[PDB]
Amino acid sequence: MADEEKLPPGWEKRMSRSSGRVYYFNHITNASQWERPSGNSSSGGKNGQGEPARVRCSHLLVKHSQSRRPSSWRQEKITRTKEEALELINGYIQKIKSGEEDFESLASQFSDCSSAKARGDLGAFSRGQMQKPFEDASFALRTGEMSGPVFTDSGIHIILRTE
Amino acid sequence: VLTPPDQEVIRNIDQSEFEGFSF
């Protein structure tokens, strides 16, 4: 029996609810991923021109009922519960990683924010014009990394860096 | 349970509030 199919303490080999898909859930820091933590044989990383002094990513923003603004260009009566927003946004990621819909094509489609026209792309910007806590934040993710539902003031939204 | 890959440590980027956009 292979013991290497196990995970180090803190990591729990979990499964998707009613789906049967197996992934890795770290209950220590609450992190989650599908790639083996020690799978350093092949790391994902795209080539981006320019150092982390400026970056360019794409995001999918979903607004909920109790948001700063309950209205948008596509829906002015946005009344969706937080559980709904989470399940729909996580559902999008799942089809993306499955190669069903690309983040770009999908973001331009399901973006609740005004970034829909730009396919979720925020553009390439340099440090200075960011909020103090977010300024150093912009430069943390590299080209090829996609995070899940991040909880900021604006609401629930995912992110993917392209440059 | 969440399912999609989400890194607790490295998840920071232009997450909307990187500018005056929205908030």
A6-37 to CATH, choices 2.20.70.10, 3.30.460.80, 3.20.20.30, 1.10.580.10:
2.20.70.10
Print the SS3 string covering A33-45: ECCCCCCCCCCCC
Tokens representing A80 are 């969706």
Is A131 in the active site? yes
CB atoms within 10 A of CB A17: 10
Beta strand ranges found along chain A (DSSP E): 11-15, 22-26, 31-33, 54-62, 121-126, 146-151, 156-161
Class of CATH domain A54-163: alpha beta
Query: Which residues, in sequence order, are CB contacts of A132 under 8 Å at separation 6+?
Result: none
Binary contact (B19, A125; C-beta < 8 A): yes
Residue span(s) of chain A under CATH 2.20.70.10 come to: 6-37
Count CA atoms closer than 13 A to A37's CA, side-chain side.
Answer: 16
Q: Measure the CA–CA gap between A79 and A82, rounded to whole angstroms.
A: 10
Catalytic residue chosen out of the listed positions A59, A64, A67, A138? A59
Contact across the interface for B19 and A130, Cβ inside 8 Å: yes
Technique used to solve these coordinates: NMR
Q: Which of A67, A79, A74, A73 is nearest to A157 (CA)?
A: A67
Active-site residue, A57 included: no
- Tell me the three state secondary structure of residue A115: helix
A135 contact residues in B (CB cutoff 8 A) = 18
Tell me where in chain A the CATH 3.10.50.40 domain(s) lie: 54-163
